[PDB]
Amino acid sequence: PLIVPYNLPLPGGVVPRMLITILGTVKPNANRIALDFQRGNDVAFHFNPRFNENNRRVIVCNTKLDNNWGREERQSVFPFESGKPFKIQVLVEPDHFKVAVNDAHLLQYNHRVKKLNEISKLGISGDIDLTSASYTMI
Ligand SMILES: OC[C@H]1O[C@@H](SC[C@H](O)Cn2cc(-c3cccc(F)c3)nn2)[C@H](O)[C@@H](n2cc(-c3cccc(F)c3)nn2)[C@H]1O
């Protein structure tokens, strides 16, 4: 397994047709997971499954600019389960990140940070065993 938190460089940033794939297994009794597509200190796209927020499961997405979080986008469809292996696919499209989990479409997140070629790191954090993180062009 890879060391968590893990930093995957994205050389030259992201671009439409770039597909990022994360494989791992959620820990027992997991509380949270986060993917952070970063532009320097800014977080262009934070994808944050919460397993116990007031005894509810929710996916929170947001952007952090100049150290400030913006408006959250929340998805109640929650395809993760403690103890189970998962695949997250993030496909960069012209106007949004498109996310599928275990081959099922989950959500889209419109680009707030527009300099896609400057979003050149992916951080992976939280309560997982990380198997692999990689990218390819489709
Ligand atoms: O915005 C994203 C940030 O959120 C803050 S928590 C703010 C609360 O969500 C704000 N809020 C919303 C509502 C509300 C929404 C709708 C209806 C209504 F009635 C109320 N009430 N309060 C988190 O710390 C922040 N973070 C998470 C992590 C993090 C670090 C390592 C692993 C990991 F997995 C995760 N690092 N930093 C980020 O996830």
Task: Check the annotation: does 70 bind a ligand.
Answer: yes
- Please tell me the total count of domains within the chain: 1
Give distance in angstroms: CA of 50 to centre of ligand 1: 9
User: 128 exposed, middle or buried (CB, 10 Å; 0-12, 13-18, 19+)?
Assistant: buried
CA distance 111 to 80: 24
| CATH number of the structural domain spanning residue 100 | 2.60.120.200
Task: Check the annotation: does 24 bind a ligand.
Answer: no
| Location of structure tokens 């680009």 | 111
Position in ligand 1 atom list of the atom nearest CA 50: 34
- Pocket mutation for ligand 1, best pick of 4, 6, 31, 72 (most atoms within 8 Å of C-beta): 72
Tokens of 125: 């954090």
Experimental method: X-ray
Range of the domain at 103: 1-138
83 lines ligand 1 (CB under 6 A): no
Q: Are 38 and 122 in contact (CB under 8 A)?
A: yes
